Amino acid sequence: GQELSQHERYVEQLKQALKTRGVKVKYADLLKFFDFVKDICPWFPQEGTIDIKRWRRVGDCFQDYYNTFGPEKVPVIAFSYWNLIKELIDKKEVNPQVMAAVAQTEEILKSNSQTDLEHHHHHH
Ligand SMILES: *C(=O)CCCCCCCCCCCCC
């Protein structure tokens, strides 16, 4: 959600990198969103976090299939992919939804094995 603002600035950074590849001028957010959103999130485009283990499984499936299918528009962007996914998470260490899925799913407030409410304790 709000993290969207962060995605904007980044989107601009990703475009610059590809720009140095001598590649034409295309949108990264869209090209990636549509492709990925439908890739790891084919039935749930609501969130869809960045994943290396999954994107890899679904990545090879569609990819290994598209290529083995002898395509007529064999894009080079392929080679670029995968490698970018790794270096991506790194520069993402900033504070994306990935880090949130942790603070949210595993709130620090959680007791030893109870809940954040903590019946034993009473604060107000
Ligand atoms: C809430 O709607 C914000 C979206 C939550 C997940 C997105 C977080 C960052 C997305 C990474 C994009 C870069 C690689 C595709």
UniProtKB/Swiss-Prot annotation:
Changing R56F: Redirects assembly from host cytoplasm to plasma membrane. Loss of interaction with host DYNLT1. The record marks M99, A100 as: Cleavage. It is found in: Virion. It comes from the Viruses. A lipid is attached at G1 (N-myristoyl glycine). Matrix protein. This is Matrix protein p10. It comes from Mason-Pfizer monkey virus. The chain holds residues 2 to 118 of 657 of the full protein.
